[PDB]
PDB file of C-alpha atoms in Angstrom:
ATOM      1  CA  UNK A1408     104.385  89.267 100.197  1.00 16.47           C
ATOM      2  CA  UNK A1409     107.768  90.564 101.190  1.00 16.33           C
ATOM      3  CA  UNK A1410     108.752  92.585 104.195  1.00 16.49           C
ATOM      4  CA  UNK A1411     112.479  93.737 104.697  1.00 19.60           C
ATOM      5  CA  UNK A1412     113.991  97.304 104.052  1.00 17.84           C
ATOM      6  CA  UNK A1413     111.281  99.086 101.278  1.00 17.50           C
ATOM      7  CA  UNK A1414     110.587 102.688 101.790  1.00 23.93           C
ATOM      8  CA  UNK A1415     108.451 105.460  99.242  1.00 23.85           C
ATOM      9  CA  UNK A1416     110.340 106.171  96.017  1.00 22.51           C
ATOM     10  CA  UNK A1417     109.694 109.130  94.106  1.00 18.50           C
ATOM     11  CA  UNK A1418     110.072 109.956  90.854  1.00 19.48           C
ATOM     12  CA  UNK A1419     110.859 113.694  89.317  1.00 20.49           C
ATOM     13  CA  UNK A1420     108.837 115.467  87.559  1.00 16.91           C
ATOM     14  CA  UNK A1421     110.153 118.886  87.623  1.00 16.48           C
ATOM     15  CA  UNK A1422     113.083 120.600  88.213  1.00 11.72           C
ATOM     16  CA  UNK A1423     113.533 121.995  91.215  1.00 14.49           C
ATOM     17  CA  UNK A1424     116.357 124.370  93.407  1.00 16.58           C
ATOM     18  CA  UNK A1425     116.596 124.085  96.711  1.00 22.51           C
ATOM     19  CA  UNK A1426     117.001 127.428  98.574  1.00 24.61           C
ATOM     20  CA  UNK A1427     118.755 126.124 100.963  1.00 26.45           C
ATOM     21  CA  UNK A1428     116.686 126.263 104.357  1.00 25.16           C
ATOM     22  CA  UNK A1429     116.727 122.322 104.893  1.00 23.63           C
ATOM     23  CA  UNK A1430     115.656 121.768 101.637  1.00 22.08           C
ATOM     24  CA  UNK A1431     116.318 119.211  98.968  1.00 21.41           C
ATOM     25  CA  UNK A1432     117.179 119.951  94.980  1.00 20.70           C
ATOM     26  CA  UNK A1433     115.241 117.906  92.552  1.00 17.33           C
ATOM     27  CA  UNK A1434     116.055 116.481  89.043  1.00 16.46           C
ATOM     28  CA  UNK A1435     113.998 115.250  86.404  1.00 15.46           C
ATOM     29  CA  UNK A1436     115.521 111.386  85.623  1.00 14.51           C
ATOM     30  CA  UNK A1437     116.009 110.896  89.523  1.00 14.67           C
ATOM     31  CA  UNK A1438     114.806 109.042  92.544  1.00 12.32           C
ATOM     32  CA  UNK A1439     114.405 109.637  95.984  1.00 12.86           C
ATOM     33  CA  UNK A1440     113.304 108.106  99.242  1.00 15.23           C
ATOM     34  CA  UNK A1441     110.347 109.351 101.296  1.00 17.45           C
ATOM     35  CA  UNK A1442     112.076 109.448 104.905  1.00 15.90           C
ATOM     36  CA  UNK A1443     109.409 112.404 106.051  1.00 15.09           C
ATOM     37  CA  UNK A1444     106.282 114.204 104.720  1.00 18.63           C
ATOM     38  CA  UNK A1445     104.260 117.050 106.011  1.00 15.85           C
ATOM     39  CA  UNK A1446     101.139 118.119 105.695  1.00 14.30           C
ATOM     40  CA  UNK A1447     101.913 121.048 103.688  1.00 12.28           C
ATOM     41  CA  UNK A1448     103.801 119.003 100.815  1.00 12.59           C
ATOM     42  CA  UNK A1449     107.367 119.250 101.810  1.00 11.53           C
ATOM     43  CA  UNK A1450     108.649 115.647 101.804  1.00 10.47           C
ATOM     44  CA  UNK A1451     111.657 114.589 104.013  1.00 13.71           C
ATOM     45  CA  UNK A1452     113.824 112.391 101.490  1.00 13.35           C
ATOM     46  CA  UNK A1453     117.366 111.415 100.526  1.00  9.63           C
ATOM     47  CA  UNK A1454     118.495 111.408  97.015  1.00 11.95           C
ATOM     48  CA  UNK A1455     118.668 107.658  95.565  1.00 11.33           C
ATOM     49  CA  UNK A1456     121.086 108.780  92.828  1.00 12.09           C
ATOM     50  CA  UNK A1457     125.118 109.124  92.852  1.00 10.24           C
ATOM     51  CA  UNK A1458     126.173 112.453  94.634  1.00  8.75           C
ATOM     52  CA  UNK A1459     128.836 113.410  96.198  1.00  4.91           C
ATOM     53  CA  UNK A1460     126.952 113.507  99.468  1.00  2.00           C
ATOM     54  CA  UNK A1461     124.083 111.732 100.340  1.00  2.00           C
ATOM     55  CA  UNK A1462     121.390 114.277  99.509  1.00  2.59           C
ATOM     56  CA  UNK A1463     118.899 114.732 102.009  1.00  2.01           C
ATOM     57  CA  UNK A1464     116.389 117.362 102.188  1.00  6.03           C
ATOM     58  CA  UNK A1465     112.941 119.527 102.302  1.00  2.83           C
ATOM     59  CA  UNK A1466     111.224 119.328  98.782  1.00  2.00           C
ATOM     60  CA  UNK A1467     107.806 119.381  97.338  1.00  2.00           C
ATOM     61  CA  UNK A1468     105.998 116.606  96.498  1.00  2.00           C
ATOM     62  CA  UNK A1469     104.795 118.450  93.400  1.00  2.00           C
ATOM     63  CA  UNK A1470     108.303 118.184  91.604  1.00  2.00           C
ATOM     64  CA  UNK A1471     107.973 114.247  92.339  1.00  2.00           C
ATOM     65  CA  UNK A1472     105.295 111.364  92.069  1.00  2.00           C
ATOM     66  CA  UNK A1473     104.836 109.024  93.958  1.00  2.00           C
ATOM     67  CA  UNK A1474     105.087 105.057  92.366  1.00  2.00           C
ATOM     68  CA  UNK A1475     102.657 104.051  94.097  1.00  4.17           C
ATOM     69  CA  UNK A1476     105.114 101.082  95.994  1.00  2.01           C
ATOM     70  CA  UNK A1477     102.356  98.711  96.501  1.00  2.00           C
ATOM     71  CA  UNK A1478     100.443  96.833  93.301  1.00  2.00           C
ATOM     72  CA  UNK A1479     100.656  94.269  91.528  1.00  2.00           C
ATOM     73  CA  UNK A1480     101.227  94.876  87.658  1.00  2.00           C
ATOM     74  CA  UNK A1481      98.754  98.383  86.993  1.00  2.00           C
ATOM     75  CA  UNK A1482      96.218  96.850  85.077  1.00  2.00           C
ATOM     76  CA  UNK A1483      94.378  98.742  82.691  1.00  2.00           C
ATOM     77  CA  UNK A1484      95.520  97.617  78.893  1.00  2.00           C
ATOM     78  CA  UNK A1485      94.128  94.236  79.253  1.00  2.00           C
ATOM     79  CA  UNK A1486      94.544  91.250  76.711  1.00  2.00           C
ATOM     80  CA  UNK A1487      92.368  88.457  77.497  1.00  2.00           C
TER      81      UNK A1487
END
């Protein structure tokens, strides 16, 4: 298939503000890349979108979604 330099994107859903304690500030319209997850929710990823610094932080996984990186065209609303 292909295997190179691919991590886990995430897309926002909500809005969120970091507080500040290693943690992460989320926008709806972004992306991000999974460097770190725990088993409480807090995902370990850096900002994939122009800042002024790299953003890297805490955040929940409940103000992203995962795209699932790994199919091959979501089926579903078939033709023929």
């Amino acid at each position: 298939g292909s295997s190179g330099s691919s991590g886990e994107i995430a897309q926002v859903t909500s809005a969120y503000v970091a507080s500040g304690s290693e943690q992460l500030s989320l926008a709806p319209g972004q992306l991000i890349l999974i460097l770190k997850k725990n088993t409480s929710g807090w995902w370990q990823g850096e900002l994939q979108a122009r800042g002024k610094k790299r953003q890297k932080g805490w955040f929940p996984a409940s103000h992203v979604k995962l795209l699932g990186p790994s199919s091959e065209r979501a089926s579903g609303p078939s033709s023929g």
